[PDB]
Amino acid sequence: MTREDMEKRANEVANLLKTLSHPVRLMLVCTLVEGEFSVGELEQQIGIQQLGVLRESGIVETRRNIKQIFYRLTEAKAAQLVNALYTIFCA
Amino acid sequence: MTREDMEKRANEVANLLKTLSHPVRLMLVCTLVEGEFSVGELEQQIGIGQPTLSQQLGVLRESGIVETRRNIKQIFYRLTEAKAAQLVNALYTIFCAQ
């Protein structure tokens, strides 16, 4: 609750902000808060390598069958951050 | 409130996140929600010395989220972007855990 505890968490906080600092990476995470989407559905949703950066960050996971690859948001902190951004930025 | 609306402000959102993506910039903003601090007070608060402190404060000036107050004695920094303060508040709710 204090700035002293926040200071101890800073590198982890700054890293998540770094993961969402790319607009494409932000829109992908914003889509993913609603549920699991295939790569095809995400292309339809965001109208666009960035999923790779997201995989590497560990905030998303993949589900794969013989037909397709599905992306799911696993870091609840990213979803809560994405949620807060709507409250702050929607006008 | 919609993703269509969010998509229209995606570059602005991503820019504020880029400004706060450096841990030093993040600790400076977290300090600055509390009130106005001198460069000297900020050095005492975050435990980072020169040139790092002024280099990161400079990035924050360029972003337009902090302003300066200067007299004959010193320079003071203040957080002006309410969106950054609101983001800081949300980060406390998300990141604080006992």
What can you see in these coordinates?
Two copies of one chain form a homodimer. Chain A is α+β, with helices and mostly antiparallel strands and 91 residues long. Chain A has one domain: Winged helix-like DNA-binding domain superfamily/Winged helix DNA-binding domain (Arc Repressor Mutant, subunit A). Chain A is 63% helix and 13% strand. A three-stranded antiparallel β-sheet of chain A has the order 1-3-2. At the A-B interface, helix 1, helix 2 and helix 5 of A face helix 1, helix 2, helix 3 and helix 6 of B.
Give the tags.
Metal_resp_trans_reg (chain B); 3-stranded antiparallel β-sheet; Arc Repressor Mutant, subunit A; Biofilm growth-associated repressor (chain B); DNA-binding (chain B); alpha+beta; homodimer; 91 residues; globular
Name the chain pair whose interface involves the most residues.
Answer: A-B, 34 and 35 residues
CATH superfamily of chain A: Winged helix-like DNA-binding domain superfamily/Winged helix DNA-binding domain
Give helix % range of chain A: 55-70%
The SSE string of chain A, one letter per element, is HHEHHEEH
Main beta sheet strand tally, sense and closure of chain A: 3 strands, antiparallel
Number of strands of chain A: 3
User: What is the CATH class name of chain A?
Assistant: Mainly Alpha
